[PDB]
């Protein structure tokens, strides 16, 4: 059975980067000629493997992490990145085995009224571990007084929303990213 890689890339909706959905790729034959010879990507760069040698190579499972970041903050999608996205939304482990794919989706993710559906949980106490997911809306306490779930001075809301617009530059347009991980069933 062919791997269902169309379901994860041409999908109408991806989750926000703070709430990135992880998919395990079950037993299936992969077709990576669909993902290298086709070139819709603004960034297509692989870590520890190549863009063409991945065909005659295969792994015990794949994890696909589908999410939305901003185009400059795709530079924060690497091992050893420490940006607001890496520390607080999606941290690719150092020994990350896999390929990172990024494409401009300003046609379906940017609107003239401002798209505030895509959030990014911009405030957190301490950093994230390798592939930690934290969707908690627990009020961001910056001070000694307990926030008790109510906002105020030193009590800021831990989510901040994107403001995606068609009138921003390439560094500020909405970009879809899905990252394929490899771990040591799925061969092709």
């Amino acid at each position: 059975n062919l791997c269902p890689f169309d379901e994860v890339f041409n999908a109408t909706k991806f989750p926000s980067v703070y709430a990135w959905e992880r998919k395990k790729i079950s037993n299936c034959v992969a077709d990576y000629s669909v993902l290298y010879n086709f070139t819709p990507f603004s960034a297509f760069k692989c870590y520890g493997v190549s863009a063409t040698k991945l065909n005659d190579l295969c792994f015990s499972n794949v994890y696909a992490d589908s999410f939305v970041v901003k185009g400059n903050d795709v530079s924060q999608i690497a091992p050893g990145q420490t940006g607001n996205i890496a520390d607080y939304n999606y941290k690719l482990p150092d020994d990350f085995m896999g390929c990172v794919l990024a494409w401009n989706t300003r046609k379906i993710d940017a609107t003239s009224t401002g798209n505030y559906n895509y959030r990014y949980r911009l405030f957190r106490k301490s950093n994230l571990k390798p592939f930690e997911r934290d969707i908690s809306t627990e009020i961001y306490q910056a001070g000694n007084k307990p926030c008790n779930g109510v906002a105020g001075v030193n009590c800021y809301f831990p989510l901040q929303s994107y403001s995606f617009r068609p009138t921003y530059g390439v560094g500020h347009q909405p970009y879809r990213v899905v990252v394929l991980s490899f771990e040591l069933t799925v061969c092709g």
Partner: antibody
Amino acid sequence: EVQLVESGGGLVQPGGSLRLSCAASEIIVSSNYMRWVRQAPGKGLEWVSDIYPGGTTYYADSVKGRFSISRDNSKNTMYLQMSDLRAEDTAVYYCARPIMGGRHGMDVWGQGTTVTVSS
Amino acid sequence: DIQMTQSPASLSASVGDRVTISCQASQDINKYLNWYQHKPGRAPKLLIFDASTLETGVPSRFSGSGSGTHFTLTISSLQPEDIATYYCLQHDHVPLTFGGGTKVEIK
């Protein structure tokens, strides 16, 4: 009230450790963006270093590898250790906070201190 | 790094004259650049955050607008208490870079 206090500034030799202390109240340093902004006499402002609330370190190229920004979560204070100080490191150093998340301005401020570097 | 140009570096006008200070960036910076009032012997004070919103406790004489690479500090009525230098700091992307300075004086 919202406040910061800069302290430990003055004269020190090149590569000396005055370790500018920035005591906080009503906000916790373990959970905040906090920045060193300096100004040489008769110059514009410049950036030095910043800490994300997770502890994440950054450095401007004029201060990279020579300075290190740090904090004491128990004492509620920020520290910038300075090493390989120079004649151009004579400036008025402020400890202050850009409101976390980029949208909002730089709410928390101290009055700043002058560090002078001379023979 | 990301360069900027403030224009002018200093200006002088009579009480109530409209003050306009520009800031040009090397690339699109959205809105996260802020404007700052530097008084001699004070901590520098904020003017506008989001490059379009007055901070609470900023005077209503200050206002800001723009997008992309050009920004404009607007003062609609100049006041005697405004004698200061002004800055356009960006925190838009690393490396973070401060503005060149613009001193206003009253004639």
